[PDB]
Amino acid sequence: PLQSYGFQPTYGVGYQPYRVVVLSFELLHAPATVCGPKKSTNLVKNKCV
Amino acid sequence: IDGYFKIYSKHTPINLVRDLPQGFSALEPLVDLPIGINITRFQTLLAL
Ligand SMILES: *[C@@H]1O[C@H](CO)[C@@H](O)[C@H](O)[C@H]1NC(C)=O
Secondary structure, three states, X not given: OOOOOOOOOOOOOXXXXXXXXXXXXXXXXXXXXXXXXXXXXXXXXXXXO | OOOEXXXXXXXXXXXXXXXXXXXXXXXXXXXXXXXXXXXXXOOOOOOO
């Protein structure tokens, strides 16, 4: 049922080994736990902002 | 609360034999847990 990949540097585009990573995620069955960075800026004082 | 699990803790000394003492104290929050699973009952754990 299994055949072995054989990769050599002589291979052209498409025949080369292409490492693939997929980031599958689950939607809102719980409080949010994983996400991106919320950017923060410098602090200011003595002026309404 | 809506999947969020909240535990409030308070450390305090006491000198009494068996029952709950009389007095006033408040429990500050310790940590909130974003678990998101349902609970129907609970059970305590001991040291053998
Ligand atoms: C826990 O069980 C209740 C019972 O109906 C269900 O409504 C609820 O969605 C369950 N919690 C989760 C996170 O699936």
